Amino acid sequence: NDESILLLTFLGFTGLVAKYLAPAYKDFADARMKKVSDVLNASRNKHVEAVK
Amino acid sequence: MLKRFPTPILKVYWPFFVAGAAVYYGMSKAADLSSNT
Amino acid sequence: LTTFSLYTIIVLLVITSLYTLTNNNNKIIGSRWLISQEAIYDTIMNMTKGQIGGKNWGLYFPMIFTLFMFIFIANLISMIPYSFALSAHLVFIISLSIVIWLGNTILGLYKHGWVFFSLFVPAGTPLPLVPLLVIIETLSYFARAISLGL
Amino acid sequence: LQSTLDNIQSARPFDELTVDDLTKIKPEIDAKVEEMVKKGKWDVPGYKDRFGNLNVM
Amino acid sequence: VSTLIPPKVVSSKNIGSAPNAKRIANVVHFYKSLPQGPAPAIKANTRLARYKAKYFDGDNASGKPLWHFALGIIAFGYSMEYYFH
Amino acid sequence: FYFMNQLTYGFLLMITLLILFSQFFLPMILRLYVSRLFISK
């Protein structure tokens, strides 16, 4: 029907994204999270050393 | 969380807005003259 | 009521929420969901200060960060079983094209003004050859609207 | 120094501190941030010198 | 010339003007800091907020949090086609 | 026909986004980055 094939394909596209794009976006988020975490931790422990 | 900082678009984005107003007016006129619909 | 208001309602409800709700409590750490903006905005600013480099970078960079997302969000209605990005009509690009071109001519006319006749000839082709170069500069300015419009 | 370190060894909430509360802790943070974007420039000298900008992925 | 107080001149200037500025920034920074991640304020629920603090929350941030919008808009559009077509 | 039904009704968001995001959206990232710069100094 007019609005049926796209409806059935929506879950297929979503599963296709979940196959790669879900873990890919997870890895991209985690990498930046750890990078900013280290960037703030180094500044913190370096300000601690400056106070020292 | 949410604030409203002083974003200058009044004296910065005035020209584009004025041009867009002229465009909307031209569209209104063409809604009656050029397209006649 | 009206269907156009319902069409624009998705934008009116997403634009404020994706930044006032997707973030946890407006925290500086950059949430896992908030990593999306944390990656997008910086690349946006890279081009913004880049392509508009100079003192003209700060003139409208916020306008760029604004205008970029409007069309992208409006066209996001494409994968639904009855999907409609502006009801298959979408006269909106007409609004953003020629008006922006006239705004460029104004930036040449409001700030640059009478020097507006000193840009169409980038390199040479003086009075012995200026009209031919202007004949394609005019086409370029005219079609820059259609290049981003439709 | 001793008290500031005592307010450092366990009093640097680097994860769950409110972002805008930095302008509360730093009185010029709010003014300059309003000042920084106000004149029109949306960039600062090495605002992310130790951070990444990243593409979509 | 004769006796003086070479060390006692720490009155006229404290050691480390740049370290003093850094430490003064440090005092304001560390003092005006939360005890341990204080002031969270995560939960919220009022008509739409019950979805905002739940579906736009970063505990998951997976693909289904955006896909709820697609499912809902599909529910709306199917009725739209039914009332339209 | 249907010309004066989505022109202004669509460009309203375009006009409003300038006041909306600039004090609302980019303010968040700008203040966050500036504050992180403060911690960097």
Nearest CA in chain C to E72: C80
Method in brief? cryo-EM
Sign of CA dihedral D20, D22, D25, D26: negative
- Encoded tokens for C53: 């480099």
- Distance, CA of C117 to CA of C136 (rounded, Å): 14
Tokens, residue C84: 């409609």
Name the amino acid, one letter, at C43. T
Rounded Cα gap, residues C81 and C69, in angstroms: 24
Other beta carbons less than 10 A from residue D35's beta carbon: 12
Whose structure tokens read 């104004």? C106
Within 8 A by CB and 6+ apart from C70, the residues are C11, C96, F13, F14, F17
Q: How many Å apart are CA C53 and CA C46, to the nearest integer?
A: 10
**What Cα–Cα distance (Å) separates residue E2 from each residue in C4, D48, E5, E8, E11?**
93, 56, 10, 16, 21
SS3 content of chain D, % helix, strand, coil (to 5): 40, 0, 60
CB neighbourhood size of C22 (10 A): 21
Q: Return the amino acid letter for F13.
A: L
Would you say how long chain A is, in residues?
A: 52
Q: How far apart are CA D40 and CA B9, in angstroms?
A: 10
Q: How far apart are CA F41 and CA E26, in angstroms?
A: 10
Chains B and A touch (3+ CB pairs under 8 A): no
Which residue numbers of C have CB closer than 8 Å to F's CBs? 2, 4-5, 7-8, 11-12, 15-16, 19-20, 23, 26, 28, 30, 37-38, 41-42, 62-63, 65-67, 69-70, 74, 86-87, 89, 91-92, 95-96
Alpha-carbon distance F29 to B3, whole Å?
A: 12
What does R_g of chain E's alpha carbons equal in angstroms? 31
The burial of D29, by beta-carbon neighbours within 10 Å (0-12 exposed, 13-18 middle, 19 or more buried), is given as: buried
Please, are residues F22 and C62 in contact by the beta-carbon 8 Å criterion?
A: yes
Check if the beta carbon of residue E22 is closer than 8 Å to that of residue F40: no
- Overall residue count recorded for chain B in this entry: 37
Length of chain D: 57
* Phi and psi angles of residue D18, each rounded to the nearest 5 degrees, phi first: -65, 140
How many Cα atoms occupy the beta-carbon half-sphere of F26 within 13 Å? 34
- The partner residues of C27 in beta bridges, in order of sequence, read D18
Q: How far apart are CA E25 and CA D44, in angstroms?
A: 20
Which chain B residues touch F27 with a CB distance below 8 Å?
3, 5
Q: Identify whether the C-beta of residue A4 lies closer than 8 Å to the C-beta of residue C82.
A: no
Distance (Å, rounded) from C-alpha B11 to C-alpha C83? 39
What is the C-alpha separation between F12 and C34, in angstroms, rounded?
27
Token reading at D42: 């949306």
Cβ <8 Å between F6 and C12: no
Other CB atoms closer than 10 Å to residue B37's CB: what's the count? 9
Are residues D36 and F30 in contact, defined by beta-carbon separation less than 8 angstroms?
A: yes
Angle C26-C27-C31 (CA atoms, 0-180°, nearest 5)? 105
Q: Provide the chain E residues 43-62 that lie in CB contact (below 8 A) with chain A.
A: 61-62
Crossing angle between the packed helical segments A5-51 and F7-40, to the nearest 10 degrees? 30
